[PDB]
Amino acid sequence: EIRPTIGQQMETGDQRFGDLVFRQLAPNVWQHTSYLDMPGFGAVASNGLIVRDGGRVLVVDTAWTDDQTAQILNWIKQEINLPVALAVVTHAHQDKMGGMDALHAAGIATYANALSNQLAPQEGMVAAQHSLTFAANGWVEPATAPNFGPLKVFYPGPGHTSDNITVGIDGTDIAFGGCLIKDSKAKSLGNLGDADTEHYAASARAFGAAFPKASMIVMSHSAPDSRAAITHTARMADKLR
Numbered sequence: 001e002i003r004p005t006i007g008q009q010m011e012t013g014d015q016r017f018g019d020l021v022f023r024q025l026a027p028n029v030w031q032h033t034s035y036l037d038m039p040g041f042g043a044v045a046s047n048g049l050i051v052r053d054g055g056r057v058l059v060v061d062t063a064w065t066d067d068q069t070a071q072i073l074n075w076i077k078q079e080i081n082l083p084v085a086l087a088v089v090t091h092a093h094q095d096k097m098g099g100m101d102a103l104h105a106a107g108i109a110t111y112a113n114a115l116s117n118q119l120a121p122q123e124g125m126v127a128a129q130h131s132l133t134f135a136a137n138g139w140v141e142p143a144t145a146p147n148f149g150p151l152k153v154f155y156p157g158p159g160h161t162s163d164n165i166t167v168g169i170d171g172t173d174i175a176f177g178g179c180l181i182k183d184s185k186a187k188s189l190g191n192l193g194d195a196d197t198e199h200y201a202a203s204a205r206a207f208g209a210a211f212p213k214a215s216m217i218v219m220s221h222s223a224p225d226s227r228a229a230i231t232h233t234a235r236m237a238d239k240l241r
């Protein structure tokens with residue numbers, strides 16, 4: 001407790017660690033959850049991923065702050081004890097990139113969509129060290145994503161932001177929609193202040209079609225859900241046109 005305003009509440013299978021919560025989703029994948037205190041509003045949860053690939057760890061998204069992001073690094077040290085090779089950050093918003101400085105201090109190599117890096121300062125964020133670029137079909141250009149192990153990085157098109165990207169984990173049932181996807185019971189699409197209302201639905205559908213195998217859809221502001229989250233996000237976006 002650890003009692004949010006937005007996101008998922010605490011449930012069995014979670015493990016608190018400082019101001020953060022971790023939940024194991026598969027033998028080599030964990031969800032990290034960190035909360036931001038907005039006075040007069042309360043605690044907003046954001047979720048990222050931690051992936052063990054052989055003998056290194058790969059991180060998807062920072063926490064809201066450097067301090068929380070260092071805490072993720074200490075949790076990895078305590079529970080995994082393997083070098084953190086890289087992190088991919090999924091768009092230039094505080095919940096996904098607020099802790100870049102913490103990663104760069106610890107020697108972790110960071111990657112973001114080129115557009116995220118160009119947006120980053122405008123959005124109050126530090127840029128990743130390296131820019132991912134994408135084919136017209138949305139798949140990352142492989143030269144720009146070296147040694148990514150099982151991470152399959154897809155740009156689905158503009159949606160929650162124009163720069164939003166997504167990540168599947170090969171050899172698991174998991175794909176990460178980030179802030180693009182909301183849960184199957186959600187009543188809205190979260191913050192649309194930077195959203196592309198015309199193209200959102202196509203981009204949600206493109207996410208689903210790019211990772212057709214995954215059955216566990218992880219997302220930034222809700223607990224992991226089924227593929228229903230994808231079709232539900234897409235219908236809710238259909239109303240935006």
Ligand SMILES: Nc1nc(C(=O)O)c(CCc2cccs2)s1
Pocket residue numbers: 006044093094095160179182188189190191192220221
């Ligand atoms: N930093 C923040 N990101 C989002 C987002 O939608 O990605 C926010 C809104 C959170 C909510 C999602 C669904 C209902 S509220 S805040």
Ligand SMILES: [Zn+2]
Pocket residue numbers: 091092093160161179
């Ligand atoms: Zn965002």
Ligand SMILES: [Zn+2]
Pocket residue numbers: 093095179220221
């Ligand atoms: Zn968000």
